[PDB]
A paper describes a structure:
In humans, CYP3A4 is the major liver and intestinal P450 isoform with a large and malleable active site which can accommodate chemically diverse compounds. As a result, CYP3A4 clears the majority of administered drugs along with other foreign compounds, such as environmental pollutants, insecticides and pesticides. To further investigate the SAR of ritonavir-like inhibitors, we designed eleven (series V) analogues to test whether the further extension of the pyridyl-linker by one or two atoms would be beneficial or not. Crystal structures of the inhibitory complexes showed that the elongated compounds adopt a more relaxed conformation, which enables stronger N-pyridine ligation to the heme.
The lowest IC50 was derived for 3a (0.16 μM). The 3a and 3d binding modes, however, could not be accurately determined due to partially discontinuous electron density, likely the result of thermal disorder. The wild-type (WT) CYP3A4–3a complex was re-crystallized in the C2 space group, where one of the two molecules in the asymmetric unit (molecule A) was well defined. Comparison of the subseries lead compound, 3a, with the shorter 4f stereoisomer, demonstrates how a one-atom linker extension alters the ligand binding mode. The longer pyridine–R1 spacer allows 3a to adopt a more relaxed conformation, with a larger tilt toward the heme. This strengthens the Fe–N bond (2.1 vs. 2.3 Å in 4f) and increases the overlap with the heme macrocycle. Additional stabilization is provided by the Boc-group, mediating multiple van der Waals interactions but disordered in 4f.
Author numbering:
A (entry chain B): 29 to 194, 199 to 211, 218 to 259, 269 to 280, 289 to 496
B (entry chain A): 29 to 261, 268 to 280, 289 to 496
The structure:
Amino acid sequence: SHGLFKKLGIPGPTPLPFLGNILSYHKGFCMFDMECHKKYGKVWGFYDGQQPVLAITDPDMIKTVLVKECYSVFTNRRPFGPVGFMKSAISIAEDEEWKRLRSLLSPTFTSGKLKEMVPIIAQYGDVLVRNLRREAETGKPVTLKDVFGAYSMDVITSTSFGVNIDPQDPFVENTKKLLPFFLSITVFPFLIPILEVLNICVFPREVTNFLRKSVKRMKESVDFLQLMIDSQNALSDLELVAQSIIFIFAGYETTSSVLSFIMYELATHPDVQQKLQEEIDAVLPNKAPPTYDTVLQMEYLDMVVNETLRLFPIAMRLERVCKKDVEINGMFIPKGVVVMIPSYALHRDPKYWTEPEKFLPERFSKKNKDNIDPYIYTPFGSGPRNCIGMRFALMNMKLALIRVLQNFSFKPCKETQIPLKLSLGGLLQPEKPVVLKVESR
Amino acid sequence: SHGLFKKLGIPGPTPLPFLGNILSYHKGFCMFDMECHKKYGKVWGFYDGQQPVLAITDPDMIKTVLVKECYSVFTNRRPFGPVGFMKSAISIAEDEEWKRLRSLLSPTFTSGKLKEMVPIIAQYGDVLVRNLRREAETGKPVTLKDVFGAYSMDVITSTSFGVNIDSLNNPQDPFVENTKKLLRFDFLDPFFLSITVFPFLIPILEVLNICVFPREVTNFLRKSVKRMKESRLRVDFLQLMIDSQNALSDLELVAQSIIFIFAGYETTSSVLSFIMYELATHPDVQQKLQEEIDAVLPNKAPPTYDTVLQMEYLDMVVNETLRLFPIAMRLERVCKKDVEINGMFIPKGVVVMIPSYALHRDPKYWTEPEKFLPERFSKKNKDNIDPYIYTPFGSGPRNCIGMRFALMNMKLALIRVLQNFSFKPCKETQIPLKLSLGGLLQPEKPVVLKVESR
Ligand code: HEM
Ligand code: HEM
Ligand SMILES: CC(C)(C)OC(=O)N[C@H](CS[C@H](Cc1ccccc1)C(=O)NCCCc1cccnc1)Cc1ccccc1
Ligand SMILES: CC(C)(C)OC(=O)N[C@H](CS[C@H](Cc1ccccc1)C(=O)NCCCc1cccnc1)Cc1ccccc1
């Protein structure tokens, strides 16, 4: 099954038996995609075990997979298991059950519901300034992911459940240890049903048994939880827990990690951090509380977040599974081949970005954003199955950037890893934690 | 009220009672703004009747009005009336209504939407080449405004509604004949010179259902858009308004559609006629432009989205023509509260105007400003260009929302036409071109040129 790409005339690295091309992951998913982006061109194919993975870079072919042929061919992602009861997760759901869950959780982040969340986040924006003021009056380098993780945990637990959880909070402690052995599932896809019918999972039982019991305590009979009960009156009780774990993890690990990526760039680029503080003071003088209209008005704030998401796409890749024999843009893709879109390799392609290594917010300016292909820059994906919490994540991260830059400035320390080396492992994280100096204003 | 600029120490022509400085418009908006820019300097003020109009020319002062203090101070334009139900149009909406309509219509011209419209425009390009070939085999000078307006009406009606109204031409198509008379602003006509100068005459006409647009063209466009709703039966301009309606009104949908139909017809065809006039009067520029198209698109290759963005000299010819002929001429903003920008106090109610025509021909910014030199916008010299002195589409949140669509439709026309034909002047070609001394930016005599095939 490894002579597939040799047959279709699609180039790619020579796979090893059983392992495939996984031994080339020693530098990471991103480094392997960039090396293959230069070695083989625009389209190459490699193997994750015996699972054939086809990488595409043509924007027209990307649009056909993500947007056009979504409900017809490229509907589901790579089968991920064993998950146990977490099979009902919208991020892992497939075919008809996904459309029911996607349409059930879509009204969670409308412009009206997002406008209601601004006063809720405005409360947590003050405790963030107060806790950072303690670490500002005392010369101590701040572990940013720590305090941002506490801020990111309160937002998603309040804007989705209405419950207040407020340094050793058992949620942040449990939600973080979903962070190895997967090396086997890529090589034993047949061991996935070995653990399904016999009920074995990959997620630790304690992080699920706690969250399953916490959602039941949350079931105090318009929120993200209130939508799932009104739609129940068909939604199951165990399916309700699976969607909460995805929202709790996405609201904590994604927002806080990107916020840590933004502060590092602003501290390592003083003129960029200064120009952003001046704009924030202009739109919001006297440290005025931010509103939904003032968040979208700050364009340089949007140009900074879009540039950081370009350099640091936490998802790195985009995966879709071809469910039947099709031919898109004059290229045949067999059934079962996982079509992959290297977001990291395309965000730093020298043939689409000038100086793709450096932090230049001028790329996303309204003067220059017309030269950016929306299918090359995909930090949240695209199509009907993109990031459903995209507008919620962009709002929460900007609310933290506004409320903090009004009161503090960020400078590098001695222990600040400059340049920031990304973790050579799996998910997109720095090797050493992001620590910076905080000075009051 | 005519002593406002005397109080603020701002220069300007002495106004007359009631009329103000309107009588200096005997040569037009452009000649008046250029005479004031040379006599009074960087900042001057005049009166459109009793309405004080402050003209600014400083790049930092223009950037503050158009970009910086947009949502807070300079958000709306001069009140234009009587318009009737057309007050809900995005170009005339004010404050929260415009902010709701602007975000509602911005996804119409994204990079993906414009790339979807290329195969649709490519269809009408072949019809344009065919009609230009009939008047080319026979030695007959062509009124470019006619053949480009029909092409501009085909493109904007299909890419925004999905309906094909003009077919094979049809030199008596109703849309072009009704849209060309939608609004013909003239000073020699009293009605406009009657208002403009006096604003205590707008609310009377509103209660009489009197509008600046004739009822014949509004009642037709009211039923034409209503007939243009065919669902159940793509995602275009019409599809965006209905999906956002499911709070958009029904008559508000026709209001925004009338603006898109007019802008797609008048702006695209008028600038194209200005471009072809410079190409015929400068065969070297037309030759050098034809060689670039043959290099990117050999053997008459069909133009695509990516190949259009590659032609630099095509972008340089369009930019220099838009410099010599800014169809908007002016950029006006209303100061809604007392402010002090760049060390200058501006009272509330004063209309801040940016003379785009006078700035595009300023000798202290452009070397030989009256000469057609596309080399000004070359990558060697484009860095020596201030983006707030050359504003053919405005700047800031309330700029031309159809800028990237207009630039594409004109280039897609220039490519497919120059691939097959060359343009030369005639006996009846007005050389030099005299601009209309009236209101809107048009030539006096229509641009007529001979069409030779290749
Ligand atoms: C900087 C922050 C975030 C980034 C960059 C991000 C990125 C992404 C990406 C790339 C995808 C896949 C798109 C595709 O496959 O085409 C995705 C899916 C998803 N995102 Fe996010 N995300 C972020 C934050 C969030 C947040 C705060 C939530 C809150 C609920 C969330 C919920 C989801 C869900 C549920 C999915 C799966 C959707 C589906 O399977 O239909 N994400 N995200
Ligand atoms: C060569 C072609 C065109 C030129 C030079 C041009 C120029 C301009 C200028 C200078 C403005 C005012 C900007 C400001 O005040 O800051 C404007 C506004 C506008 N233009 Fe155009 N335009 C062109 C074609 C088009 C097209 C094709 C459309 C299609 C819809 C369009 C729709 C509009 C609208 C709706 C506004 C008002 C925007 C608002 O009020 O928010 N224009 N145009
Ligand atoms: C990396 C590897 C090989 C291990 O496999 C993936 O884990 N890969 C996913 C498949 S299942 C994933 C598992 C999971 C993780 C944490 C908690 C619960 C389940 C999953 O459901 N996570 C949804 C998290 C929400 C989120 C996270 C980041 C950005 N936005 C939203 C495929 C996938 C990757 C990235 C985005 C969406 C889907
Ligand atoms: C000569 C005078 C007084 C009229 O003076 C202006 O022309 N002044 C406008 C004010 S109302 C204008 C009226 C109108 C005209 C024709 C059809 C419908 C309404 C208006 O709304 N037309 C929008 C047309 C779209 C367009 C036209 C040209 C370029 N792009 C887009 C203020 C104004 C000027 C320039 C751009 C936008 C607004």
